[model samples]
Target: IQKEEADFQKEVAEIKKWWSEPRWRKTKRIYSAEDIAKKRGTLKINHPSSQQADKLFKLLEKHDADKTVSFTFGHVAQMAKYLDSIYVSGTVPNKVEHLWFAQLFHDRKQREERLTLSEERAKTPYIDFLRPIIADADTGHGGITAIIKLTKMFIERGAAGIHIEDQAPGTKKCMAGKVLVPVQEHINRLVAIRASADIFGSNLLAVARTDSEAATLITSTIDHRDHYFIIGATNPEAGDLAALMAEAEIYGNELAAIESEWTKKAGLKLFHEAVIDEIKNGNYKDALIKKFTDKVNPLSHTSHKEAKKLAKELTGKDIYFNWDVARAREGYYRYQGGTQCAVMRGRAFAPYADLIWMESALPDYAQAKEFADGVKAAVPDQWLAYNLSPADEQETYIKRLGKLGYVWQF
Candidate 1:
C-alpha cells in the first residue's frame, strides 16, 4: 500500500479499539484517538504511541487477513527495521531497551527526509525505524504503583504494548519451577497497565502471560481457577519432616532422600485426589468406574471447602486435605500445573489482556493444540501468544499455530 493511500482516521480508530471498552481499562471512560495522542504526563511522548499502536493492530489484521503470524523480538531494537514489532522482555533491563525505542524512533525522521523526495521511494509507506515495541512487565515488579511507573516508562519511551505475567514478583525462574501470584493480583497489574495508559491517554497494548504450566507453588489459592490445582497434604497427622531430620546430616544425597521421604510422608495430593482416596475407600463401584480427577474436569474451579462439602455430599465423609501443612518452608502452597492450569489462567486474563500468552516448556505442537483448544472453548476469539523453542519446524510450526488464533509469535 502506498504511504498516501493509508487512511489516517482508519488507523486512529484501530488504535482506539484497545481502549474502546471501559472494563478493559481502569479510567472508566472510553478513550478516543485524539485523547490518546494528547496523553501527557510522567514524561511527554516525543514519539507518537498511536502510530506504533496502529501498526500492531494492522499487524494483527494482516495476520487475520492472510492467516499468518507476526514474529517479534524481546531484546534488541536494531532488528526493528526487519520486523513489524520490537518486544521488550522484563527479564532484561527495560531502561536500556526503552532507550533503544527512542533512538530508533528518532532515526525514522532521517529516513523520512531522504525517501520522500523521489516519487518511487515516496510511494513506500513509512512506518518507523522503530516498530511497535511490546514490552514485558513481569509481575509488575511490585504492585499497582510500580507497574504504572513501568507502564509510563514504556509509553514515554515508545512502547505500543506491554506483556505482564502471572508469575509472582521476583519469583520468576528458568528451568526451576516458578511461584505465581493470585489470578486477581495479575489482573490488577493488567488493570494498572491500562490505567496508566488511560490516565496518560494512550492505548498501550496489554498482554497477559501465564507461566502456570511449570509453576511449583502459588502465593495464594484465592482465585477459583487455581483452587482445583493447589496442592495440599492429605496426611496432616504427619509431623514436620524438617524437624525430624538433624541439620548436620541433611545435605547432598541424604537431603534428596529426606525430601523424597517427606513428600511421601506428607501424602501430598491435590484436593481431588484426596476426595478420590475417600471415595475409593468407600467401595463405591460406580465412583471407581467414572472417577473424580483434575484431568476429567481439568478446568475445575471447586474450592477446597467446596470439595470437602462435595465429599460429604457424595461419599458421606469429610476428605482430609490441609493446604497449610503442604506449604514449603518458604511459605507457598504447593501446586502442580499444566496446560489446563495455563488455559484456566488464559480465560481469566482474556478480558483484561489484549493478548494471552502461553509460555510453553517445549515447541510441542500437540500440547500447543490442547492449550489453544482448551482456552478457545471458553473464549472463542481470544488471541494467543506463543514462544518458539530452539529446534525450528520452519513454516509448519507457525502456520499450524496461525490457524489456532495465535496472532503473535516469537
Candidate 2:
C-alpha cells in the first residue's frame, strides 16, 4: 500500500495534466471495458457537493484503480434543487428517469466547476440509476430519439458508464415495483443504446440491468381477472385447493376462447370488459392456480420468462445482461406459489445474464450473509452486485456487505 501512494498521486496528476489538451479532455478516455470488468468491488458515493467528490476521490486513490464509484438518481435528486430531499426515503417515484438527466447535467456542472478552479477535469463516475427511453416520467419520455440525445449527453460529459433497467413506461416506481417491459423490448432498448454509442463514437460501458427479480405486481382493471383470482383464493368461502386448481384450468381455457372470439371480432375493449365482468361476478374463485394449461397466461404471451429467452438470443456477446434477484418473490409467487421459485428463477436466468444484482433485503447481517453464501454456492463465477441502499434505515452495515465482493452497491 505504501509503495503505491506515489504511483497513485502520479496517475492522478497525469489525468489532470491531460485535461489541459483540447481533444484529450473531450475524448473522455477514463475507463475502458477491461478496466470496469476486472473490478471485484465498487461503491456508490453520494456526492451532495463537488467537495465530497474530491474528498472521496483522494480517499479512493490509495485503493485499487479498478475500485469504481457511481451516483444514484435518488441521491443526486435530493441534492439538486429541482427535487425534494425526501426522495431518498424511496417514497416518491422518479418515474421518467428524471434523476438520470438531472445527475448528468449536475455532473457536467460539477466537472466544469472543478475545471475552472483546478484547471483539471475530475474523473466522472458511472451513472447508477437509469430507466428505459420511455420510462414513466413527465419529461424526456421521448422514445429512441430521446435516448440518443441522452446518450450523447452522458458521453460528451465523460461519464464512465450507465446502467439501464427493464421496467415498462408510465409505471416505473424505483426498485420496489414489479412492473417490467417485455424482455425483447428491453433488449431493443439495449441495442438502441449501443447503436447510439457507436453513432456518437463513445466507448461507454452499458450495464444492462434487470428489475424483474424485485419487480412487484400492480393490479389494475386491464388485468383484474388474474389479480382477482389470486386475492379471491384467500377468502374462506373459496373451495378446496384441488377443486380450485381444477377450476383454474377450465377458467383459463374459457377466458382464452372468449379473448380469441373478441380478437376475431376486433373488440379488444369488449374483451377486457368481459374479463372484468367475470371478475366482478365472483368467477375469479375458479381462475386461481399455479400454472396455466391453456394458451393464455396472466403474464401474456411475451412473459418475463419468454423475454429472458428472447433477450439472450438477441443481444450480442459484448452486451452484459444484469439479472436482478432482489424481490424474486414477486415473479415467483405470481407464477407459482413455490418457496424456491426465486432461486429457480435465478438459475433459469443465469444463462441469460452475466451479472446478478442481489436486491434482497434482510432483517439483519446474518441473514444477508446467508443469502450471499447461498448465491455464491449456486454460481460462484458470476459477477455479483448488491443494492445496499444508503438511504435504507435497515442496512447500516455497508462495509461488511462490501466484504462479500459485491462488484457494485447502490
Candidate 3:
C-alpha cells in the first residue's frame, strides 16, 4: 500500500514539474481544425465544487496523466443544483458550474470547461447585473459584443477550451427541453468569439455547440406566423379559441392543397417542401400556429442535416461543430434510443462536424463502446466525447475506446 501511495505521489509530482515548464505553461494552444481532429474521446466529469474538480483532476492525472479529460459544468446536474437550492429554497442563482470550474482551475494545467452562453444578450437580462464584474464602466454585455468579454475571461482564467451552445436564455435547460434562436445568430456568435480570440491574441479553442436538435426550434418563419396568430386571437374586438381553430383548419387545408399540387407538378417528396415554398413566397408567415405547431420545430435528424449545410455555408473551416447527440432519441427516423440515434447522427454529421459530444448518458459503457465502434467504422477519422456521472470510471471506457482507435490524450 505504501509503495503504491509513493508511486502515485511521484506521478503527481512529475506532472506538476512537467506542467511548470515555462515554454508550454506560458502559452495556450488554440486548437486548429487539425487539432480538433486529434483531440478526441474526452471523459467528462461534473465540476460543481472545488473539491470535485481537484479530486477528479488528481484521479485523471494519477490514471492517465497525459490524457485530456474535460470538466463539464452544464446539464441536468447544474439545473438540479440550482433547483434544489434556489427554486425550492432560499439560495440565489449563480453562474453555471463550468465558469466556476474555470475559475477553480485558473492556475492548473490541462484544465478545460464546457462554457454554455446564451445566444443573445437580451435573452439573459439578468446578466446586466454583472456589468461591473463582466465589463468595465466603458464596456457592456450586449449581443455579440458580450462574447468578447466572456471569451477574454475564460482565456485569461487558463481555460484550455470552451463550448458555446446555441440556446435561448429564456428557456434554456440541460435536458431535452430547449429553445433555439436562428442558425444565423449562432453563426454570428461563433464569428464573434473567433474574432475576439484573434483580437485578444488568445489561443483558446472555441467550440460551437448547437442544441437545435433537442431544443424547440423557433425559426423566423415559425415566429412570424406565431406573432400573427397571437395578435389575431387576442384582439379585444374579435378573438375566440373556436375562431382560431377554424382559421387554423383553413390554413392546414391550404398547405395540404399546396403539397398535393407540388407533388403532382414536381414530385415534391417531403412535406417540408411545401412549407419551405410558402416560407419562400412570404405568404404563409401569417398562417395559424396550431396548424403547424408540431411540424414547425426541427427534429434531431433535420436539425443536424440543416446544421451541416449551414455550417459549411457560414464558416468553412474556422470552428468545429460539436453535436450534442444525447437527447436525440426520437429523431426524424426514430432509432431505438439516444445511443443508437446518437451514433447514427454522429456518423452522418462526422464529415462536417469536427467533434461529437455525447451530452447526457450514464453508466452505459457497453452501449457507448458499441456506439463508438459504429462511429469509427463509419468515419475512421473522427473525434468523440462522453459525459459521465461522478461514480463512473474513466479508464474503464477510455481504454476500450483506445482499442477502437480513439486518441483521447492531446
Candidate 4:
C-alpha cells in the first residue's frame, strides 16, 4: 500500500496563509437578498432524490471540510505526532470535508463541569486524529458568553463550526413548536460571530441553527445576517401525511411572510423583492410543495419541503429511544451519503431501538468502529461512515464504506 506524502513544510505554509486572510467580519457580512438566493440554491435538496443527495455528498467529498472535519484537523495534527511512533502521520486536511462535531450538550453548569474532563474521557484526541470535519452541538444552554467562549474554544482548538439551535434552555422537548426570540436578541447570537471569528482566526464558521420550535428565527433573520451556516425545522406533530403536510404549510407561510417583509423593506432591489413578493402574493400558489423539486422555486416554498425531508429523515425511524442513540440516529438516519454512525459505539448494535433505551453495554470504540465499518460497507444505497480509522488508514472491515458512506467524528 502507498500513501500521499504529507508535505509538512508546504502544508504549514498554506495553513498559515489560509488563517491569515481577511476574515468575514460579522454584522458587516449580513445576508442581503442576493445572499439568500445564493444559499437557497444549495440547501434545497429533496431526499429520495438521490441526485440532489448525491450533489451534496460529492461536494462534501471534494471540499473535505465541516465542523467535525475541523476538529479532525487538530486531531490529525496531534495524531500524526502520536503515530510517528507507528511510522504514519501527515498534514491536516486543507479543503472542506463531510464532518460533524459533538454537540456541546448539557446545561451551562453541567457543561462547565465537564468541558476538559469530558473531552479527555471521550477520546476526542483520537477522534480528531482521523481528521474528520467537526461541528460542536451546543444546545445554547449557557449564556452568550459561554457560547462565545465554547465556540472559540472549538474553532481555535480545531472545528469547522458550532451548531447552536434556537431551542430555549431546560426543556426536555427538542426545538419544536412556535417560539420566537426577539429580533435584537436573535441578532445578538449572530453578533457573537464577530468575537468568535476574531479569536479563532478566519475561515471558521458559526452555524446558526433554527429549530422547529423557532422556525421564525431563520425566516425573520434570513436576510438580516449572513450566517456562516443555517438550518430550518419541520413540524413536530406526530401523525400521517395529512398532518405532516398541514404543518409544512404553516412552515411555508412563516417563511414567506418573513422573506416578503425582509425583501420589501426600503432600499432592497426589485428583483429580490419580486421573489418575496411572489411568496407574499401567492404567486407560487401552492404552499406545501414537496421538499425536493427539480426546478428551483422561492425559498419560502422550497425550504418547506427540504426541511420536511430533513426532519423526517432524522426522526422518522421509531426504533430507538436512547438519547445518545437518538442523537446519532438523526445524523445517520437522515444522512443521504455517509457512514453508519452510532453515538454510543456499541457492537452487536441492535436496529430494533424502540421506546426503551438500548440497555446493551456500550462497546469499546475500537470494537464499535469495527461494527460500523461492517454496516457502512453493506449499505445498499450510497452513504458514508466516520471514526473508522484515520483518513489514510485502511478500513479493514468495510469493502464499500466509500460507496456507502464517508467518515467523520461519529
Candidate 5:
C-alpha cells in the first residue's frame, strides 16, 4: 500500500513515541510497528479523545511538581473551577454518568472555540471545559475480550482513562467481603487493558488497583507472591470449616460463633506463623529464627513447600499446614492480605499500569506510606493514587499523602 510521505512519516513517529515511553521502557521492550499491529490491529493514532490523555498527564505533572493534590469530581456541574478530570467507579449505572459529563464538557469547549464571546465574558482568560473522564472497570467482570469491549465503550464515549481493580467478579469496592483473583491473572488483565488502549490508538490511562488489604479470601493460591499469606490448619485433627459452617447454618445455629470456634479448632495460621511457633517451641530459638528470617521475606515469592523444607531442616520434622483443608465452600483459599500484600500487588501491576492505587479504607499516614514506599521501591518514579476520601480524612493526613507522591485522588 502507498501513502502520502509526510503523513505516513508523522504517524510512524507517533507509533515509535508510544513504544518508547517510560512505561514501555520499564519492561525493557521494543516492538516494531508491524509487531504491534500483529497483536493490537492496524496502526491507528491522532484520535481527538486519545489526545485528552495527554492533558490529564500534564495536569498530574504540574500538581506533583507543585506538591498539590488533584481531586476527581463525580459531577461536572458541581465542580465550579480547577477541574481537569472527573472520576467514576464500576457498573453501567455510573457508565452513563461518565459519558454524560464528558460529553457536556466536550460540547462546551467546542462552542467556546467557535463562538465570538459575549461582552462580559470576553474580558476573562479562556477556560478549557473539556476535562477528561477516568472511569473504573472493576475486575473487568470476565475475560480479556469483554474488558477490551468495555474499554472501547469508555474510549468512544469520551473517557480518557480506565482503572481496573484486582478484586474478583461481583465484589464491590471497599467492602470487607472481597475475593481476589491470582496476582498473575490480574496482571494479564492490566496488560489486556493496555492493549485495548493501543488497539484504539488512544492514550487511555491504564490504572491498576489492589484491594488486597480488604480481601479475606482469594479465588486461588496459584501465585507464589500470595503463598506466604495463605492460611492453613496447623493441627492434624482439623474439621472441614466450610462443612461445619454449612451444618451450623442449616441447624439455625449462630454462624459467627461457629466460625470463631472452627478457627481455633482447626488451629488456623499462616505457614510462616506455624514455622515461627515451631521454632519458638523448639531449641536454638534465636539462631534458627535468624536463619529463617534471612531466607524468607514476607513479600518474597516463597511457597509453602520451601518454607516447610526450611522448617524441617531446622526442627528435624515437617510442620503441619494444610491450606486445602481450610478452603471455603466457594473454593476460595484463606488469605490474610495486609498493607504489604497490597504493596506487593501494586509493584507487580506498576509496570503495566499508568498509575497504581492501593485500595485502603484507612486514612492513617503509616498505612499509606508503607504501600507507597513498597511500590516505589520497584518503580521509583511510579505515580500512586490515593483512594482515601478527602472529606472524611484529616488535613495533615492528606497533606503528608500528597508529599508522599499520592498525586491523584479517585
Candidate 6:
C-alpha cells in the first residue's frame, strides 16, 4: 500500500511538471479551412452549382410571392452563408457536429438576423463571406424531392450531415402552449430528413425537430428516421403553451434515460423553494430577511435615485440625491472589472443594481480581502494567466462570469 501511494505521488508530480512547461502554456489556438475538409468526407459527385443555390433561393421567392407567405430568397441566401461559416470559422468540433450545427445555424440565423435586419440598414459582412463560398439547396422549399437535392449540395460541400426540420424558419419559434404543426406532418418531415441522410450516407446525423402539439411526434419522428432530435422549448415571449408542454413531454427523450431536459425547470424551481422552506423551518426568518433587505438596499439607493432617502434612513442625516462618487466608482469597477473608461446609459439608470449583490452578507472588508488572499495563495502563480503581461501571455483575456443570490446550490 505504501509503495503504491509513493508511485502515485511520483506520477502526479511528473504530470504537474509537464503542465508547468512554459512552451505548452504559451501556445495559442489557430485553425484553417483545410482542417475542416479533412474532417468531413466529400460525397461522390460533381460540385453543386450556383444553379442549385438559385433553385433553393427561388423556392423561398415563391413562398414570399404569395401575400400569405412571408418567406424570401434573401432568407435562403443568408441561411446558406451563415451555415458555411461554421466550417470556415472552425467552430464545429468535428464533421458530424459541424454539419449539424451548420445546418441549424443557417436555418436559425434566417429567423434571427436575415428576417429582422433590413437589408438597406446594414448587411452582415459575415453572411457575405459565406455566400457562394458555401452553397446550400433547400428541398425545393418543402418536399421529399427538395430534400434529396439539398442533400446532394451538402455532400458536394464536404458535409457529413444536413438537417431539415419538420417546421420552417418563421414557424420555429417557441410556442409557449401551442403547437403549430401536426404530428404526422412532423413524422413526414423526419421521414424526409432520414431520406436525405440515407442518400448522403450513414455518417450524417439526421436531426428531426417537431413542432407537434404533443412531444409524442418527436419519438415518432425519431422512430421513423432512426436519427437524432433537438428538443425545443416553448416560446417564452409569445406564451406558446403547446410548445412548452411538448417540450416537457419530449424533454431529453432518448438522451436522458427518463426524458429530454425532462422535468428540467421543475427541479430548478423546486430547489430554490426547498431552500426557502428550509430557512423558514429553521426559524432563521430574521437572518433571511436581513440578507434580502441588504441586497435590495443597494438597488433602492443606487437604482431608484433614492440615495438621499437611504442616507436619511441609515445615518439619520439628509444628503444630496447624487451618490458618493468613490463608492459608485468602486461599484462600477466591481461590475465592469477595474476599467471605468466608459459605461452604458442603462448602467447609469440602474446604478443600484450595479452594486455587488452578495448572497452572504459578510460583516467586514477584512473577510473579503482574506478570501481573495487565500485564493491567490492556494492557486499557484504560474497558473494565474491574467497576472502575466499581455506580451508575455499567449492569450488575450479570460473574463469570469458568475451568478449570486441563490442559496439552493451548495
Q: Which residue pairs collide, candidate 3?
A: none
In model 1, what are the clashing residue pairs, if there are any? none
Name the candidate that leads on TM-score. 5
Which of the two, 2 or 4, has more TM-score? 2
Name the Cα RMSD for model 5. Answer: 3.5
- Give the Å shift of residue 331 in candidate 3: 21
TM-score of each: 0.81, 0.37, 0.36, 0.27, 0.87, 0.21
What would the per-residue lDDT of candidate 5 be over residues 218-332, giving only the tens digit for each residue?
9888888888888899888877887777766644356767777778787778888888877777476688888887777666778777888888888788888888879988788
Instruction: For candidate 5, give the lDDT of residue 140.
Output: 53
Best-to-worst order by TM-score is 5, 1, 2, 3, 4, 6
Give one digit per residue, the lDDT tens place, for model 3 in 15-54: 3453354322322233343333222222222212323223
The most accurate candidate by lDDT is: 5
Candidate 1 per-residue C-alpha lDDT over 256-280 given as tens digits, one digit per residue, 9 for 90 to 100: 7877777888888887777766666
Note the clash tally of each candidate: 0, 7, 0, 42, 0, 21
Q: Candidate 5: list runs displaced more than 4 Å.
A: 1-14, 21-35, 39-46, 80-82, 90-114, 118-122, 173-176, 245-249, 389-393
Winner by lDDT between candidate 3 and candidate 1: 1
lDDT of 6 by residue, 294-371 (tens): 633311223322322432453343322211111111121001101110011112111111111111122233332332
Model 4 agreement with the true structure over 1-410: per-residue lDDT tens digits: 12222343334444345434333211233333232233222223222112222233344444333211211222323443432111111212111121212112212334565574743656533321222233433444555886676555544443444344343443334233223232344345555643454333334433333232112122232322111112211212212322334445557667567444432432222222222333344333343223322222221223333433432453342211111111111221111101111221111111211000111123234433444355334332212223322244444333333232332222
lDDT by residue for model 2 (170-208), tens: 555544445644444444555555555544433344444
Clashes of 6: 21
What RMSD does each model have against the real structure? 7.2, 17.2, 19.5, 21.0, 3.5, 24.2
RMSD to native, candidate 2? 17.2
